[PDB]
């Protein structure tokens, strides 16, 4: 469903049927609420605990098809452009894509074959570097986030005498905003995430109704305006 249909059905669900009808929302307000609902729905559905079903990214066909249109595969760029201070002497720094929302799978192709990257925690880092070996298992590599500016920088730790040829990253693309109308104005150009032009929902139509319902709920919570509504409907921001 296109942006016109979002706005029309938003009006229908918000104030065209309600008894003591409230003031209609401006298109900037509707676009804001739709974008917020979009991010909220994505974050609810990625985490099993964030939604009532207890199901995460790949725990049912619906959850697969939800993010099917948001999955992207790219490559990390070796960060030898400038010098830097790595926490680990034997770690190669790589830069992830700018439009990165969540990492779900990583892999590195070395001279010794492909190796799955395991994102090790800081407590797991401390535990693993206390052992005599201090290297990953056969078919894996280790990863820790390093000094990041304007985009995520990543430290890859592979076994000794191994060189990395490429670093593929299956991530979830950052959702584009939903903007109903050209927000250009003579009084000042307003933007949702830096874009004022019309922007369609770049996700599957399976969750367009979901985003609309969340937008309506947020609109009515803002209309109520008490601390209670904001606190209870902020629990789902996550």
């Amino acid at each position: 469903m296109n942006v016109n249909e979002f706005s029309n059905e938003f009006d229908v669900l918000y104030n065209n049927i309600m008894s003591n009808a409230a003031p209609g929302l401006n298109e900037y307000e509707k676009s804001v609420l739709l974008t917020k609902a979009q991010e909220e729905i994505v974050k609810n559905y990625f985490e099993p605990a964030g939604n009532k079903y207890g199901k995460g990214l790949d725990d049912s066909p619906k959850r697969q098809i939800d993010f099917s249109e948001l999955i992207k595969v790219g490559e990390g760029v070796l960060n030898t452009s400038a010098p830097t201070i790595t926490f680990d002497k034997r770690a190669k720094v790589y830069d992830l894509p700018a439009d990165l929302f969540l990492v779900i799978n990583e892999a590195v192709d070395t001279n010794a074959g492909t190796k799955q990257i395991v994102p090790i925690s800081y407590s797991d880092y401390t535990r693993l570097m206390s052992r005599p070996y201090k290297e990953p298992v056969k078919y894996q590599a280790w990863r820790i986030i390093t000094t990041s500016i304007n985009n995520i920088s990543v430290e890859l730790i592979v076994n000794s005498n191994e060189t990395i040829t490429d670093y593929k990253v299956r991530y979830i693309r950052r959702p584009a905003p939903i903007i109903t109308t050209n927000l250009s104005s003579e009084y000042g150009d307003v933007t949702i995430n830096g874009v004022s032009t019309v922007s369609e929902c770049e996700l599957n139509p399976i969750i367009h109704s979901e985003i609309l319902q969340r937008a309506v709920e947020l609109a009515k919570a803002a209309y109520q305006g008490d601390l209670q509504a904001s606190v209870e409907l902020g629990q789902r921001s996550e």
Binding site: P132, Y133, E135, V137, K138, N159
Partner: protein, 226 residues
Amino acid sequence: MTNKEFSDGFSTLLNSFGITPNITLDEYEKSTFLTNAQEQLIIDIYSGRNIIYGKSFEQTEEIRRYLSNLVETYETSTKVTGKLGLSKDSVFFEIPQDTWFITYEVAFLKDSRLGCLDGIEASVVPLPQDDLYRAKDNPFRGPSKDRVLRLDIKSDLAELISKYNVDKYLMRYISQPTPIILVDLPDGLSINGVSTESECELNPVVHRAILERAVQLAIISKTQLT
């Protein structure tokens, strides 16, 4: 089996990264447990203490085919000069320093006194120290033209007590096996002083028994406190 096959079979037998509870090892841990299993197995085989086999060093064809690749022969004519022995006619010879157990040990003699028998090969008899005093004068078990007494002493030495001069000393021992190292280990690490990859030098017949014992040692290591 090769090092790659060793690691892959180790993972398969341990059910690494399966759905059921399991154990995952680093290649260093795999190397450590494979080496421990190797050396335990060959020592138990040599001593005949393995209940599965229950046979000694060369007691059957199976054990021959297992430990055939550790049997090393050695020759030496040099004698260590400054040492204190238990008899005047005591000569000392160095050991190759990689020996595990001496299995054949013979000594050639060069002396004028045993005329026309010169260059006689002589059986080195390992003799305990209890028997030494009462074996020095023994004409049936003591030193003679066809028999030499060897006593082990410090610094990897062999004190050969003979009535005649000893010219050459021949050995056939079981050697240190090369460790089973599946990866070039980082700096500092080593197994038996070896840092690079090291393939098992025994026959493939015993590689799978070594793998089974290494797997059992792994489960014991992870499941000795639970």
